[PDB]
Amino acid sequence: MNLEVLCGRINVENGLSLGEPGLYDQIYDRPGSEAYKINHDFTFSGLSKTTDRRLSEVFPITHDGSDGMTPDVIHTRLDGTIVVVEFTTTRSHNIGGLEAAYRTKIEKYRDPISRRVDIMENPRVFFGVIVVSSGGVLSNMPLTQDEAEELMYRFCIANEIYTKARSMDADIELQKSEEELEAISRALSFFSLFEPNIERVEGTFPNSEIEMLEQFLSTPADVDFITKTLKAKEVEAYADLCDSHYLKPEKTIQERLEINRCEAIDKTQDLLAGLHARSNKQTSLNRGTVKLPPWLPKPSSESIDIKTDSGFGSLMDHGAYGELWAKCLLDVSLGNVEGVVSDPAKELDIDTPKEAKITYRRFKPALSSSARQEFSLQGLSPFLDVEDIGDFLTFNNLLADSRYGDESVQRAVSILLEKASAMQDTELTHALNDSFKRNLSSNVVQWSLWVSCLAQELASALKQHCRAGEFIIKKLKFWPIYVIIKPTKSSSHIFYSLGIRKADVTRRLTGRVFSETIDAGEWELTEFKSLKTCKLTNLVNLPCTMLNSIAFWREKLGVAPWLVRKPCSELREQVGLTFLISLEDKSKTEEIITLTRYTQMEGFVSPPMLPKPQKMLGKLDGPLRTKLQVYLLRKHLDCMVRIASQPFSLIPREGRVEWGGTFHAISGRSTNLENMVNSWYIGYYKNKEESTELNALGEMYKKIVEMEEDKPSSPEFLGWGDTDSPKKHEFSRSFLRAACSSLEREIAQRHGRQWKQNLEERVLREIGTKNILDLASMKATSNFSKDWELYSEVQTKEYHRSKLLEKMATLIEKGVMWYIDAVGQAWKAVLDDGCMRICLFKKNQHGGLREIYVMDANARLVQFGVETMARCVCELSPHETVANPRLKNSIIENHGLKSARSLGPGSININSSNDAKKWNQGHYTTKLALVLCWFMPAKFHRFIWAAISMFRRKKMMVDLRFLAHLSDPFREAMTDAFHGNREVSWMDKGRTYIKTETGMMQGILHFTSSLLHSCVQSFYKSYFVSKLKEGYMGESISGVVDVIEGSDDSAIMISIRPKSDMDEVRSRFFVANLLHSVKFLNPLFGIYSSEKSTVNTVYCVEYNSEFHFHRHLVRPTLRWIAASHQISETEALASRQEDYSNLLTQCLEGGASFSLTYLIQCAQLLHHYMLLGLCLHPLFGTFMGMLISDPDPALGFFLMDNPAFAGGAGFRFNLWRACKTTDLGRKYAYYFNEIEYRALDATSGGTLSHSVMVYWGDRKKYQALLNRMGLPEDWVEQIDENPGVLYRRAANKKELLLKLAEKVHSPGVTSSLSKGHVVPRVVAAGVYLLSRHCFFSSSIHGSTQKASLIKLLMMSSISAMKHGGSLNPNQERMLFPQAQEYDRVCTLLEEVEHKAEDLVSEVWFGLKRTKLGPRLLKEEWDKLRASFAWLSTDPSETLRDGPFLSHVQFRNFIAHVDAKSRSVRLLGAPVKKSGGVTTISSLDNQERLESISILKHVLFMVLNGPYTEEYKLEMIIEAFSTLRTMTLCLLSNSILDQIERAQSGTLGGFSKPQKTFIRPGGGVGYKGKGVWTGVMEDTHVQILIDGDGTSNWLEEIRLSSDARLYDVIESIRRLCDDLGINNRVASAYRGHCMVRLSGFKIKPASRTDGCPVRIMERGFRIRELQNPDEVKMRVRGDILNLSVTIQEGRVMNILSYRPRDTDISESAAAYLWSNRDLFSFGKKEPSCSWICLKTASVLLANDRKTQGIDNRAMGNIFRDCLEGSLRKQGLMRSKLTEMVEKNVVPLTTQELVDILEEDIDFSDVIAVELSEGSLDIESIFDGAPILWSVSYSSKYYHLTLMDQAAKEGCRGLRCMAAIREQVR
């Protein structure tokens, strides 16, 4: 297709441009003498070709140091731009395997073209590269979708042709194999050696033998068994369908839809009866569900002391509970306190903090024998009357503003908010903040703040070992409340009782749902409630999880954050429910709201089928303990009685069809579709802290073993022969083979016919060759051994898990290396030691990834070797949506178009949702071994077989406290199993290890099950196609099938066109069966479909959590919002903001508008300032006053983003917005522009800090007991003696030890082995560093940052932090009017791609790294030396200088300095930006402009140019200069002089002229030393010039402001070119300059190399009265000049103009077509037909002008347009071998078929005669719905005569030579 159009697509501003490389892939259905080059010139043929013979050496860009080597295409457009492109092909199927080609191509051409573009005049040069592969195409030749595939059709064909003529494949690639040889050889050596232990391996493990592999790979599938099994299963599926739904008797939907309603009522009543009987029948219970008193007191002044003249009473009324408070008040009144002084680093490992951080916790004594007797004892039916919970959910004081808006509790944060928002000071922000304070006084965060205070306080009291005589008492602060704590012997629970004076309680939040309260003598005591520790990390972040419900839900209702309405009735219910659920943290309370999803998705069920929600019942049995759960269950048990009677309805409006009346699950309200789907995620949160405790840990032991005893005795069904029937734990062999033999075909038809010979040489190249130790991981592991099994042996020891540096070091000392001499021991170490050894972890959230297994760091090695061996096989398969990361958003969204290319307009859609019941405990390790050793080519067998022969007797280690507590029918079983019989044989008599053979593990053996599921889905597709091809007695229905599936998740999409009346109904039925049969035919494999699937949705697809409704995408937003509070235990105090911003930037992709991801930031503010300190450590005042003056993110200072575009770009963007303009602008400069230690420089993450908050952490255990292998105490000095070991990999053991020692001690590698309730462990880690810096000084050491600093330090800044940073200085204040519109949007993406430290490695070093040319490669230092003044070529002096101490410390400062904000993807309103916001719920010039953009290039003599525009400006009269068009309006042929005195032109007089000298060659000679001044874009620069020999040069530059100098340099790059000054010679440094310049470059200062640009704010502010009468207009090589002569023979261009190529209009041609008045457009030439662009007869009339030369005005070379004969000779094709020997692609793409890879044909027949046809009642086949989710004609008539008159050269070799002249 064109070269022309492709070249015409791109654009550029100046000099040289590379653009941005893009990556296209396969989306549509991919169709389809002697030489060795066919692979290249078969593709890119016909066009990639320039029909000009050479064009040639790079000549057109002038002169030669190079040669100018020969490119492929060198195009030149009609606007002067030059385009050079090169094409090359690669055979590597891996993405990123093209990066190599894209890097080695630009290397060839970057040097000479950069050299030539610097030695010519204004230049437009474009360099681009094109690379193609069998899998994709990477280019920034910015192509479209259709031809991207066309480039691969020919590529595959060319490779097929190429492979055959190939010989000794002698090409070896010299650029590769430098290290890849030394790598690959090692893996070859190893795998060629002896890894198996095969004689005793068959005995150590039950079923692992080399008799299944050989009898599996060499036996073809039995087609008879298959053709009988399918025929037996289809009839069963059909009979089951006709009876689970009622179809046999003649009925209609009406009386059909009721029978299932009646039976669902029956089933629900049955369940209710079964529950009621098995409980203590008790009608009116009485208790509280919220276990905290409903006190809301007006806060007061902050203090931490138990106030005094209160205490006394009446306390003495009871003598039980008031007596206790009286006794403690009287104890604390006088003396009786004690010195228990929690310190902040007794708490942790550490120095010597000061007095103000040690606080009191005041013992108490105890009470007499009245109440000890009572303190010692304290120290369900489904028919309950629970409607009190409803009364609470329908009436609340919750969302009702209190009167506490201005109190001391928010005044602390209402000032940090001011300081943060002090940057984006707009009217919008001042309205988006007073709408967040309105949510900080809403009567619920007020009640939650003191609850969070209490929870924080109680978290610290999990220790301190209070005496036998015991009590504690604190007044949490900001409000008078008093607690009494009593720790326990343990860490599991805490006792407390709240007391409060009866006068400060102003308001109670209401209802009868809160716990009762003792009514004492004017006090409220709360009688010793108890709270566990697993329920503590929640109550802490309670305010931050209510503000995200008062804001989110308030937004999903059509409310505006800048309005104040009454709380709607539909709002109170949604808030009072997420309030209740968040406090009853019991697991089975949320397991009921979650299952409102799988029971409501079933309402989308299509025709013939029925919504069956009552199948979700066998999971709701429960014990039914608590009270709220009762209401939840009895409400949820009506959403499956309301749906089963009336499904959701379809309504096609010609619009992309929406659905009927949906409704809320719990409270039934017919709220909208996108609104209900979030209600399924009300109770959801995430967490990572280990939750070792009795109850929950029990269920996770049952889950692992529940399918253990199921394993069959006989192994004849596991690996062996067919079964025809599964036994709940085994599968058939022949089906596995016939399924894994389909993916191997679907791979080879896209990628290969050769591919193993690349997959191997890739894996091999990667597996053991680039895995160099000393970089394995910090992944915590386990140390479990045989000496730990007997419970009687060590009943009292502990368990630390040895984060995984021990196996690292103990090997590193042993002369180890590549991880390839390491499988070396550790396999023997496992074989002769028994089996795998595994411990467990419970990350409690409620559910999800809730249990992870550690690996023991000794089977981890042999597992990492098989991880990649399968991750690389997954990367090739096309359905894999877990190896291939992003394509999951490119198969559902592309089914779409892909349906329509195939068949007209359309659709119909039929979609499933699949899943698996038990994906972990259902598989058996023979399947994965067979799949792997089936794909891995030749020698991967003896290794993978052994490495998979390890999960056969696997031993798991249960908690120690568990067994201690041992000495529900399941714990009773485990007890008997441990002490004495019935025997389980799972743990044998009396030991500690769950031992099991059945089932893979959760996360360990990953990327291997995905292969299995891929083969299964491929077989399913290849069978569905084959059945669609035979629908009814030979009649073939047509349709496409798409299968997308990750691990334990699947989906199946189908579409079919209806061309009639039964035929839709006659066809839809035939689909249902075919799609419903996947309940069967999976048990033949090891896959069991659960009851969480939904079959036959008609227009939606439910895959992972994103749902695809017909044309509108919807994603749970509430899933990620409540995931924005996770607690941070890092210790880089500045990494907390990094993590907060990272977690925030996901709510954007979650569909949250911009007005919400700023309130989320406002909440994260609280969540962040609550952890440093806000409720304890009464020095926050000082800690606030410090940051209120300093503020920087390096200390605890939070940075809020821009309200519009909130959370769009990451933290780095905010660091750029704030450091640049008015945040600091000094703390960073001082680090960069002073020599000889503000603060020792150290970088954390992306930012950089004072290296004081990067200190706390226990490095001791790794180096006091692990410095036992050399590593002398001279370690830092000995490294500093040579710093070369920091950048190269390794040479010996010693330097490897040094590298390990440097790795252990910097960031973030902590080893002490925390047991603590992490919540105080973060407040400590905050306040410690925040205090040890307060005791100022360093703060007494002028600023901005220069433009050259931002570029090196923040690289993306001009790329995309200026576009967005200038479009937000857009309406920042406006207020749009609310409209209504529904529309599909685009897919937008900002910073996608496919460094600044490698520069150092080489001046110092050698080592062949960053491949620059010695122009740029030897010019990068200059730019790198200019910046970070004190930096030099010395490896040592880098040191004797600033802000490092040491070279070792700086590997981290050059390491991340930099840094490069992430990726964000987001929607829109269509295509163009500030067109993405959006969201947040005059032609006369054009005709004239065209008549100039075409005019400058016409055949014309230069003087005839101004003959036409001068006269042209008499009729096109554009308006005022009140808004490049500005210059155009500047052409009135007022006064003009002052019109340039404004608006970004350039002018300036010559203040100090030089001396003129008459040189004897017709030219005057300027010789004196003069000065030029000017005013360009508001700088008022001075230009000092001098020269005494051959020419003049540039002495000095001055300028008044540094805001813009990258543009000013351009205005001076040409201003010397005008007047003729050279910039090569050096100067003598005069003052303190910013930087200096070489011919046109930027530099250091410290070198005194060239002309220094010494900025002086006051340098020169004068101008000198230029005379306006000397003003001309000029023309040249196409350029406009409204210039002025300043000196005799020296002119100065004021304005210029270069016409773009995107302005060649066609509407102006009509206007210009003959209003014959334009005399310049007469009868003299194709003028008036070139301009008015259409081809008396001028063809023959030009063959005369080229031989007889008499063209009074067309006096050019005579060949400027006549070379364009190829434009029309291009649309006529010239490719010989591409059309005649190219049998038209005959559409060989049949998708798949069952008769291929099954050697024999198939016959699959069922019975469909007389059931019924009239069941469906609707019509959509006739329905509307749609599309499920230049200017080259110059000379065209007079060319076809050449086609009439008639490789071309050969032909020539007469009557047409006159035309051949025009082409040559």
Ligand SMILES: [Mg+2]
């Ligand atoms: Mg699913």
